[PDB]
Amino acid sequence: LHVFLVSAPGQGNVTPMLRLAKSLASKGLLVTFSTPESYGKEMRKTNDDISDQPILIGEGSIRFEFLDDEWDENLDAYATHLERVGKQNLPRMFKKHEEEGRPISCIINNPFIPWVPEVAESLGIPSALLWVQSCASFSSYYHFFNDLVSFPTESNLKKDVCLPSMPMLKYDEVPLLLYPIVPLPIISLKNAMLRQQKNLSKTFCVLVDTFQQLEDELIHYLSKLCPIRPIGPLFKISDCIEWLDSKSPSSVVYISFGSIVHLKQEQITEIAYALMNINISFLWVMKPPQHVLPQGFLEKVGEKGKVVKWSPQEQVLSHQSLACFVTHCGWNSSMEALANGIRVVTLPQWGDQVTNAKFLVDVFGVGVRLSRGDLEDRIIPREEIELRLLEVTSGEKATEMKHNALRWKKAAEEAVAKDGSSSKNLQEFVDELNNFR
Numbered sequence: 001l002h003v004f005l006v007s008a009p010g011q012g013n014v015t016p017m018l019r020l021a022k023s024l025a026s027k028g029l030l031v032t033f034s035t036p037e038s039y040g041k042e043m044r045k046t047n048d049d050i051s052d053q054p055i056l057i058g059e060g061s062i063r064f065e066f067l068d069d070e071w072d073e074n075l076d077a078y079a080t081h082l083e084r085v086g087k088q089n090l091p092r093m094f095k096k097h098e099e100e101g102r103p104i105s106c107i108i109n110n111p112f113i114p115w116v117p118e119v120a121e122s123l124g125i126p127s128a129l130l131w132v133q134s135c136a137s138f139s140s141y142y143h144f145f146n147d148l149v150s151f152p153t154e155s156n157l158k159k160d161v162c163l164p165s166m167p168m169l170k171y172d173e174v175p176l177l178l179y180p181i182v183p184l185p186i187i188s189l190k191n192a193m194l195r196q197q198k199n200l201s202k203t204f205c206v207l208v209d210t211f212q213q214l215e216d217e218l219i220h221y222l223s224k225l226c227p228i229r230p231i232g233p234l235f236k237i238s239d240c241i242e243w244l245d246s247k248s249p250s251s252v253v254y255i256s257f258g259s260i261v262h263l264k265q266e267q268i269t270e271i272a273y274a275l276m277n278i279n280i281s282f283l284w285v286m287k288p289p290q291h292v293l294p295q296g297f298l299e300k301v302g303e304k305g306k307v308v309k310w311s312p313q314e315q316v317l318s319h320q321s322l323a324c325f326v327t328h329c330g331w332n333s334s335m336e337a338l339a340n341g342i343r344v345v346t347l348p349q350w351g352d353q354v355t356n357a358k359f360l361v362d363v364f365g366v367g368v369r370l371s372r373g374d375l376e377d378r379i380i381p382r383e384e385i386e387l388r389l390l391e392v393t394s395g396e397k398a399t400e401m402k403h404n405a406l407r408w409k410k411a412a413e414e415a416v417a418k419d420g421s422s423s424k425n426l427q428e429f430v431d432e433l434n435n436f437r
């Protein structure tokens with residue numbers, strides 16, 4: 001088999017599609033991953049395993065055949081141009097593979113190049129979709145595009161939303177890209193999402209980065225409208241740690257916010273005071289673009305605290321020292337917290353991070369809510385942060401959320417085990433690819 005994995009620019013898009021690539025390669029498939037060269041060569045220069053040629057995994061390999069971007073530096077501006085070059089170029093690359101005994105059986109794309117199922121359609125090549133957010137978020141988008149349930153509008157900005165097989169969200173707990181008020185540099189992601197929901201008809205399979213028991217009933221309901229397959233999580237399918245060793249177990253407050261979120265300086269300074277004040281141990285990831293910490297922060301907290309510029313998150317998350325996780329609640333981060341058994345402290349910023357935060361707190365039951373997101377735009381005072389740090393590590397539910405945590409970590413490892421739901425959804429989808437052939 002030979003499947004073509006096409007992904008939009010961005011760390012958050014490429015990583016999961018790569019992980020879907022290392023997985024299909026593990027199953028005797030040859031995968032060719034591609035992404036715009038402008039950001040592609042940036043992966044080249046910044047990654048150790050570049051591409052001299054295929055890179056075997058199990059009995060399959062992963063080739064690299066980047067799309068010529070035709071874009072040297074000169075968001076909506078680039079999206080339209082990229083769509084232009086992609087349709088220009090992608091048949092030319094598929095046509096090359098046609099004459100070298102490599103007819104492509106399937107294409108895989110993510111929502112932020114939603115036009116890809118159109119080239120798949122014209123060229124006769126079946127189209128599938130890698131969805132990188134939860135299944136509650138997919139349902140948010142699908143119901144909204146087809147307008148099957150009512151959302152906030154300009155005339156009612158605080159309307160609740162009642163999605164089937166979901167807890168009733170609130171106006172600011174629906175994925176922020178469906179809100180009718182959106183920054184004009186971001187409207188282009190709203191349009192990409194919505195365009196992908198228009199192209200769903202042409203698509204025979206949606207591969208979702210979640211597993212069957214995390215969103216059990218939801219996946220059953222939407223599976224009648226939609227061809228949804230849970231195959232996750234993908235990260236588990238396929239000096240920092242020396243320091244945490246010295247600490248006692250379940251003791252270190254962990255603090256990341258992914259590699260895009262940039263908090264506000266006032267929010268930084270309320271957290272540093274919070275940590276100082278309750279005097280907890282911590283590992284706070286402070287990625288550079290320059291945030292300042294209070295005068296004598298480092299000396300005051302001592303060896304109880306530690307600030308770093310980057311962290312092996314998956315590793316760190318698998319540590320017993322960790323007491324909790326202050327997170328921006330991206331999908332992969334919510335799932336890495338779930339699968340590893342760690343309680344969370346939710347600081348949603350934008351997008352679907354406000355839905356996942358509603359889920360971590362009130363559904364999966366694995367922690368405490370610190371903020372409600374950009375639409376709240378309320379600098380959270382250190383007093384409250386200190387309260388949630390107490391609530392999640394010492395307080396009356398602290399062990400019940402620990403319990404709930406260690407049970408979603410059980411179910412995650414069963415989903416990915418040999419004859420588990422997530423793994424047999426993979427092999428089946430691979431089994432479907434042959435039956436076309």
Ligand SMILES: O=c1cc(-c2ccc(O)c(O)c2)oc2cc(O)cc(O)c12
Pocket residue numbers: 010012177186189260350351352
């Ligand atoms: O809605 C999205 C919003 C943003 C974003 C939001 C606020 C910012 O101040 C910023 O610099 C980026 O970044 C994204 C980045 C993504 O990969 C996907 C998204 O939906 C978004």
